[PDB]
Amino acid sequence: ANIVGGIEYSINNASLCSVGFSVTRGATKGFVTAGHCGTVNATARIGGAVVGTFAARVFPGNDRAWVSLTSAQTLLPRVANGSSFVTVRGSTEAAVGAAVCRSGRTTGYQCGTITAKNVTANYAEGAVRGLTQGNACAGRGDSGGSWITSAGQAQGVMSGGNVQSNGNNCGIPASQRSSLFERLQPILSQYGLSLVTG
C-alpha cells in the first residue's frame, strides 16, 4: 500500500484510525499514529491487506504509537488533502497562534490555529497530558492522523476532542472546539524514528 498521512487503516479488523506520518527506524519502515488506536502486536490493514503490526504504544498518560510495516509498503513524505498532497518537510514545532491543518479518514483535511499547549484531556481510560490544542474540527475515526502546517512542518497526531452527538466538532464554532494532538517530537526521540521527507 502507499503510506500517506491521513488515510484509513483498521486494527484487528475492528477499529479504524488514520495514518499520521511515514517514518523509518534503521531499515524498518513504519508510520506514527495514536496510542489509543491499538495494543502492541495488534494487526493493521490498509484496504483489507495486512500492512504491519503495532510495535509500541503509550496510552493513556501520552497517546502515541508506531506500527512497523512489511518490506512491501511504500513510504511517502506526504499528507492527504482531498485528491492532492501536502509534502512533509520536517518537524519544526509551531507556536500558539500558528495556522495548522489535520488530515484523517472521517472529516478529511481541516485547518485552524493552535490555541494552547500542554493541555490535559481526561479520557475515560485516564488522563493524557501535554497535548496541544487546535481549533480545526475532527471526528471519530480521525485519531492518529496528521497535524501539519501548510509549509510541511509535521506537528503531531490526532488524539481527541469535544465531539458532539454527530461524531465530530465540525458543527460548532471554531471558538468552541477543542481538538487535541500528541506532539511528534517526543514520539520520534522516544522510538528513535526518522521522518520521511521530500
Binding site: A121, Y123, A124, E125, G141, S159, G160, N162, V163
Partner: peptide, 4 residues
C-alpha cells in the same frame, strides 16, 4: 473530550 474523548479519543477519536
Amino acid at each position: 473530550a474523548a479519543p477519536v
